[PDB]
Every structure is written in structure tokens, then in C-alpha cells.
Amino acid sequence: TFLVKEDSKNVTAYTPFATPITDSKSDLVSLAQLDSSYQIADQTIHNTNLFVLFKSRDVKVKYESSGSNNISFDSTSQGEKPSYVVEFTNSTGIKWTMVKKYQLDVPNVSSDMNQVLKNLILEQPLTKYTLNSSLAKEKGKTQREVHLGSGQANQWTSQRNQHDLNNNPSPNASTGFKLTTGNAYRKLSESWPIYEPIDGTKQGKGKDSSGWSSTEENEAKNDAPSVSSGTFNKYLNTKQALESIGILFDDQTPRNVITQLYYASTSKLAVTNNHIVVMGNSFLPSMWYWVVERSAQENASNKPTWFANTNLDWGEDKQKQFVENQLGYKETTSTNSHNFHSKSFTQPAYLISGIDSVNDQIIFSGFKAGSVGYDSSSSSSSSTKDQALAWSTTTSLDSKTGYKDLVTNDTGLNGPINGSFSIQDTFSFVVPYSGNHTNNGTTGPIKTAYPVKKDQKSTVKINSLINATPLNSYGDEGIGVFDALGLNYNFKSNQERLPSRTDQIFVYGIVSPNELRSAKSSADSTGSDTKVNWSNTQSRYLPVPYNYSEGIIDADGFKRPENRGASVTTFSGLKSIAPDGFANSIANFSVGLKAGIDPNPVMSGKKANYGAVVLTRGGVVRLNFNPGNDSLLSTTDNNIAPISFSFTPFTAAESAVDLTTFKEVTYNQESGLWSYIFDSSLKPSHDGKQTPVTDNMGFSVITVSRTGIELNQDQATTTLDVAPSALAVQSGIQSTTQTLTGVLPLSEEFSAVIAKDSDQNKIDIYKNNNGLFEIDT
């Protein structure tokens, strides 16, 4: 029998004949002995029992920079509503009864962690209505402007050696983006605004919470009023959009960053034979995750593990350093120059695609949320004051071809180097040279350095920030756009896309029960921050489709003259033509990670195959694993890109689907097919211009199938050299009128759709032809 979620707290069971079981509508929130403010966040089936995640709309969390126990629930005003994971069972018809109830307590904080948190600042979440221009921030100081000062041009050649930028050919390379304007950056105790600038290069107060609350917020309220009578020339009102992505409010005002971080961090559920795993959502970053031992006592506090303590394998040692060297500045010749890199932490947040389990293994994926240092000096003063220190790390044109050599390239490892370079009859934004290489021949090794002057080394305060997108540098320049859309190509006979290693990074992997026990120990460590190691992980540069932006039509080394023009080179300039329910065409999104075991037989004496699929902006990604080792699939040749990742573009039908309305991902074990359910009723009621939405009705379903030569099929396929892929195709189940309840996969050859057009229910039976549906009236 199949289970259907009637609403935010009720669950109704159906027989395989698409008929509802009488007296089966159960209120699990009531059953779990939880109050009205709670609703079911995620459901999964393990060991035949239903595991349910619950989260309260009434949760309140505080961050107190002083003290030992910094992150805590606000007991005082009935905000001590932690999230719960409950095991339910059938005691027979359908009669649910609670087995175990686990509570997810806030994270513990060390002395070292709290020194980052004290001055940690966070970007306002990205919305359905957020533009390329809202995201855009004013360009920072030039490399020669930081280390040398103003009017120090054509003196670079003689002075670059002292500042340890020996032979560096890019004085004009940007050092980051200014934080005095653009999208709001807030402390964990501070709250985010309902307003978003239309142009971040001009409108906005960035990290200046004080300057916003005193003067700018009032201009914002006047321009972009809630419900319209408003002008909407400088600002967008996204209260409705914010609310639709899980933002909690005190009427009009959103709750502080820490509360939003908690509520969104308890979004997805995975269950193994000994552990329960809880991760965040795709909308806003997750700085932690929960590993709950299923053997935990009735009233015990289950604490999360920080991502800043979970050391991942980025594929290569160099790939990890790239991410870390940009997290902040080291040495701390100041005293309060605390950031993540200095306090010896790793990547602190991820925008989680999802989490699932196969053969007691946990599978995760997501994009790495951008994180960089920033200056907070407050005065003469430092040249980098009120600015983020981020840069492009895209592989140089002169680099060796072959995946391993492209990703290990020392281009932009310690400091910035990319810009704009004229090559023959075209151009590039990536530095043409690395090592001893120059146009004349060999000139001595090229050096890079963190954008901090060595004279101002002591009188500088480099603290930490976290972005709401997979973009590290938002500085309004050429290279920013090519790194975001994947428009950097080499010029050698065999073309190759030069990857970035900090911007639009997709991280994925498989976690063992012992790797999860390690994670649990780190959450329970008191005193020192205990470090975790996840071995079977990988990273891949996954950018947004270039054709989602107006003005770009191909991806080649040769670039047309019109493509050096400002209108299609900077963020504010760039215009979106993306149909996937996002106003921006620059930041990538991922959702619906679901793994499944292949029904097709494998060679005798070999373990059954299993993979995972996930949806990203522009296509479907497939994660390939070796079942004999329960590791990521790999191959002998390093020149070929990790065979554990595959990407297949979408067509106009799949691109048309609003990725922000993802409801549920299912997998049919007998078919080997994934059903991606999108409910249009998950749309916000009003635009950024407060105009009522008129397309929040209906649904859509996408089928995902395995393609390619699969492992251990025969004697030849015992090893692979090509990554097996996936295919996303609009199933044929869709509506613009009906409001979906759920989809019953009645059989391999049949499916049932439960919906309401005018309150009364309707059961639609569709004919299934290996993933392709046509209605049976």
C-alpha cells in the first residue's frame, strides 16, 4: 500500500487499486506528541517503518558572541521548539504508532569557532525574483592599487618582487568586491531585509546593517511597499518569495540569520541501519548537519557536526587548497584577524542538493556556497577596507590538457591573476601564461599573493563571510561572467573548457557508517574542534547554461567582438532569458538527489549496481559508484575527468519546468526510473513587484533514465573509461488547472494521479510506456 501527504500534517494510505483506505488519514504531528506549530518536513521508509522529520514555524534561536554556550533556543518567548525525527509503525488496515522520537539540538561552539562566528557575516538568500544585477556588487581595488597604492602605474615591474608577485602580469587584476552597497550581509544575531536592490552596484547597504536601518531601509520601504501603489525603481519586495523558501517572520520582520540557518538546516532526511542523517535545503546554506545514532536514549540531545570540521576530498590536494586559500588570510599579525582559513577550518557551508541511502551508505551532493575573507579595519586606513577578498581561479590558457593537469594548475592559487587579454584576432579573460611562460619565452616563475599589503599586515582585520550562491566573487567584471557561464576555453588544437576551482563548485560523495560515526564524535567533542575525513567525495566545476543569458550563443575559444561589450560582460549588464523559474541566469541551483539500485542483472559474483541522479539548472547529473567497494566509480587515465560524474542537457520541455517548485523525487525499483514531481502550488503569491502570481496552479513530472554502458554487465565491462549517463524527459503527466495531492506508481505499466480541480477529488489513470505517459479516460 502507498502513503499520500494530504496536507502539512496528515497522511492517507491507498491500496494498489488507487482506492483510499478508510480510517487511514493520520495526523502524525499529533501522533508524534508535537504541537500545532509543527509540520512534516520530510518522510522516508526504512526497515518497513516510516521516519518523519518535523519542524516548527515557531522556532527561535539566538547567538551570543560572549560566553561558552553561544548558539541556543530562545526559551523565554516559547521558541524552544527543536526539530524532531520520529519512527512510526503499523500495528495491524493502517494504524500508526510511535516507536522512537529523536530531537535535534543546536550546535556546540568552541573558543576557536566562536572567534570566526563573532564577526561572521551572511548574504541574504537568493530568490526566484533575484536578478543578475541584484547579485552584482561594485568591483574592488586592483592588485597594483592594494600593494602599491594610487598613481604607482608602470612601476609594477620594479616593485612587484618586494610584494612577492614576482613576474605577475596582471596589475589590473581585481582583488574582490566592495561591501558598502549591494545585497545585505548580516551577523548571526542580525536579521535580513524583505528588500533586494534592483542594481547592487548602486542600491543597497551590503554589510552596513547600521546604514540600512537608519536611512536606506526607509527609502526601500517607500519605493517597494508590501501589499501595488509602489514605484519599484530601486528595490524589490520579496517577502512572499522569502516566505515560500522557508523564511520565518515576526509578522513583517524576518527572524535573525541564526534562526533561518536552523530552520533550513533541518530539511532533508536519510536513514541507515544504525544512523539517521539530517541535512539542509537547496535554497540557503547549511553550516552543519545531524548524525543521529538510532540507539540514542529517549530524551538525549542529538547535536550536529559542522561543515567547517568535515574535510572532504575535492578530487586533488590542489583542488582543496584553492577553496581554503580564499577562505581568508593567515598569520594574524593583528589579534582579531579571525576567519575560517586562519582558525584552520575548511569549507564551512554548502547548498545541499539532497541526501539519500543505498546499501547502508549515505549519498550527498550540492554546490559549495561561496566563502571569502573581508576587511573590517574602521581606521589613515587599509586599502582593502569595507571589501571582500575573492578572485578568479580559472586555469591558464597555456596549461596542459587533461583533467588532472587542468584542475591542478597553479593559476590564481594564492592571489588574483585573471583579467582581459588580447590574443591574435580574439581575446580571453583568463591569464594566457603560468610558470616561467611569457610571450617572449621564459622569464622566471609567476607568483600570486593574498590581496593584503605587507606594510598594513598588522593594522588589518580579515574576517569571514558566506554567500547565498555557488559564486565566490560577485565583483562586476568580465571574468566573473565567463566563470559563472563556463565560457573560458583554451586555444590549443584540442579545445577544453578551463575550469574554476572556487566558483560554481558541485561537491558530491558517498559516506560509510564509520565515516558517519566520526562525524558524530566531532559533534560530541567538547573543547577542541575535532576533524572529520570523508574519502569518497569529489568536486566538479558545474556552471549555468550559457544560453540561459541573452547574447551568448556558443562556447568556443574564439570570441566575437560584440562579446567584449559591457552589456554581455558584466553582471549588471547581462540579461536573463532563463525559463526555469529564476530571474537570474548566473547562479546554479541543484535539487532532488535520489539514488536507486539498477534492476538490470549484473555478471555472476558481482554486486548489484546503484547510482544517483540530481537535477541542476540546464540538465540532469548522474553519480556513478562501484558497488564492489561502495566507492565512487573511477578509471586508470587521469587525463579523463572523474567517471563518477555525468551531465546531460535538458530540452525546452525540461528547461520550462520551474526548479523552485520541486515537490518530491521517487524511484521505481522494478523500472529503474526516477519520477520528479513539481507542484506549481509551491509558487509565491506575489512577484518582487508585489503583483499577484497567475500560474501557481497545476503540476509537471519529469522522468529520468539510465543511459550508456553500465558496469559488470559482462567480461568487457568489468572496468569503464566513459561515465554512464542519465536522460531527463518530460513524462507527459502535467496540468495548469488541477492542484496535485500525490502520484501513485500503481505498477510498472500504470500510474495514478490524485488532484483537486474544484475541492472534489479526481483519480487520473495514465498509461505508462517505459517512462512516457498518456492519460486513460
Author numbering: 27 to 118, 121 to 255, 261 to 412, 416 to 813
Q: What is the paper's account of this structure, in its own sentences?
A:
The human pathogen Mycoplasma genitalium, a member of the pneumoniae cluster of mycoplasmas, binds to eukaryotic cells by means of its adhesion complex, the Nap. This complex is formed by two heterodimers, each consisting of proteins P110 and P1401–6. In addition to their roles in cytadherence and motility, P110 and P140 are immunodominant proteins and constitute the main target of host antibodies during infection. Here, we address the structure and mechanism of the Nap adhesion complex and reveal an intricate interplay between P110 and P140.
Using a sample of P140–P110 complexes, with the complete extracellular region included for both subunits (P140 residues 23–1351 and P110 residues 23–938), we performed single-particle cryo-electron microscopy (cryo-EM). We obtained a map with an overall resolution of 4.1 Å, although non-isotropic. The P140–P110N X-ray structure could be fitted as a rigid-body without modifications into the P140–P110 cryo-EM map with UCSF Chimera16. Therefore, the structure of the P140–P110 complex found by cryo-EM corresponds to the conformation of the X-ray P140–P110N structure, where access to the sialylated oligosaccharides binding site is occluded. In the P140–P110 cryo-EM map, there is no density for the C-terminal domain of P140, whereas the C-terminal domain of P110, which is absent in the P140–P110N complex, is visible, albeit with a weak density. This indicates a significant flexibility of the C-terminal domains with respect to the bulkier N-terminal domains. In the P140–P110 complex found by cryo-EM, the interface between subunits spans 2758 Å2 with 30 hydrogen bonds and an estimated Gibbs free energy of –20 kcal/mol, resulting in a 100% probability of the formation of the complex (PISA server). The interface between the P110 and P140 subunits, defined as tight in the cryo-EM structure of the Nap, is the same found in the cryo-EM structure of the P140–P110 heterodimer.
